[PDB]
Amino acid sequence: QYPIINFTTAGATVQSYTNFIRAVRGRLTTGADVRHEIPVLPNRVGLPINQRFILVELSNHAELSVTLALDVTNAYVVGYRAGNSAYFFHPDNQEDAEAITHLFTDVQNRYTFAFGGNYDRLEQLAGNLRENIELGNGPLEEAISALYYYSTGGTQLPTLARSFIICIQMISEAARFQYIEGEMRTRIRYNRRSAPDPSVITLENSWGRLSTAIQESNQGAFASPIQLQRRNGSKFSVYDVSILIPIIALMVYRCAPPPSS
Numbered sequence: 393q394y395p396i397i398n399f400t401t402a403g404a405t406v407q408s409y410t411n412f413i414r415a416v417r418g419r420l421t422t423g424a425d426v427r428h429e430i431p432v433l434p435n436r437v438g439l440p441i442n443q444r445f446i447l448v449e450l451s452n453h454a455e456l457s458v459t460l461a462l463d464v465t466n467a468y469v470v471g472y473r474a475g476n477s478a479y480f481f482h483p484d485n486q487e488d489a490e491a492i493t494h495l496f497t498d499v500q501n502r503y504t505f506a507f508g509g510n511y512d513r514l515e516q517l518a519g520n521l522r523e524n525i526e527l528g529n530g531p532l533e534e535a536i537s538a539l540y541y542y543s544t545g546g547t548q549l550p551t552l553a554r555s556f557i558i559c560i561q562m563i564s565e566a567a568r569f570q571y572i573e574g575e576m577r578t579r580i581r582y583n584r585r586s587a588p589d590p591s592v593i594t595l596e597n598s599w600g601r602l603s604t605a606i607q608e609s610n611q612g613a614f615a616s617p618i619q620l621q622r623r624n625g626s627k628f629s630v631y632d633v634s635i636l637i638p639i640i641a642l643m644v645y646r647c648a649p650p651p652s653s
């Protein structure tokens with residue numbers, strides 16, 4: 393049965409959140425596949441169902457808990473459980489539709505949302521963009537409560553979507569990028585919430601293209617440079633994998649690696 397990582401916003405310190413992110417990366421990647429020192433997530437093709445997900449049990453100071461399911465192939469939050477109900481984002485394809493049946497299997501009340509969980513959708517539903525949604529231990533504490541009270545009608549759909557946007561970035565994006573992990577640690581250290589600045593938003597937006605560029609690179613070198621933003625929104629060209637080693641922690645599997653040469 394699928395591995396669970398626990399995290400609580402109640403204790404929270406930079407140490408406990410680091411321990412949390414590090415254990416999520418640890419269950420996401422196997423160590424089989426590392427390219428230019430960056431781990432690659434498992435290939436979805438031929439990945440057996442018993443290896444497909446991880447679970448992240450989130451608790452909060454209000455004594456509630458909720459369990460998110462992450463897909464190990466892309467680190468995406470696919471769904472969540474709170475007590476007796478589970479909800480899943482609308483699947484992209486038939487294979488994902490079947491795969492999600494293997495989650496939360498004894499829950500009474502299982503629902504699939506009619507909408508997908510990509511940021512663009514969540515952001516319409518929330519009536520707010522990532523750039524205007526504050527992140528930190530307080531947002532997370534409140535996201536946990538919001539997800540936990542959805543089934544009883546207590547949480548409005550825009551707050552639901554906002555709450556996922558919070559969880560996705562604080563968990564899946566932080567697992568993807570050391571840089572994003574460190575942004576969160578800052579928020580937790582000073583106990584202040586704040587919205588992600590362009591340096592975070594551009595990394596999130598670029599994860600898939602960065603993954604492809606790295607895996608397609610010639611000995612590290614990008615065929616086409618990729619534009620990121622710094623905190624003040626200015627351009628930063630990435631020409632090479634080397635500059636990303638302290639920034640990106642995990643990549644999505646695009647292709648088998650070429651023979652080392």
Ligand SMILES: Nc1nc(=O)c2ncc(C(=O)NCc3cnn[nH]3)nc2[nH]1
Nearest residue numbers: 467468469470509510511512560564597
């Ligand atoms: N539930 C969920 N979990 C995630 O971990 C996640 N990560 C990135 C994006 C996103 O829209 N990223 C940009 C993108 C662009 N095209 N597809 N995705 N959405 C997500 N949603």
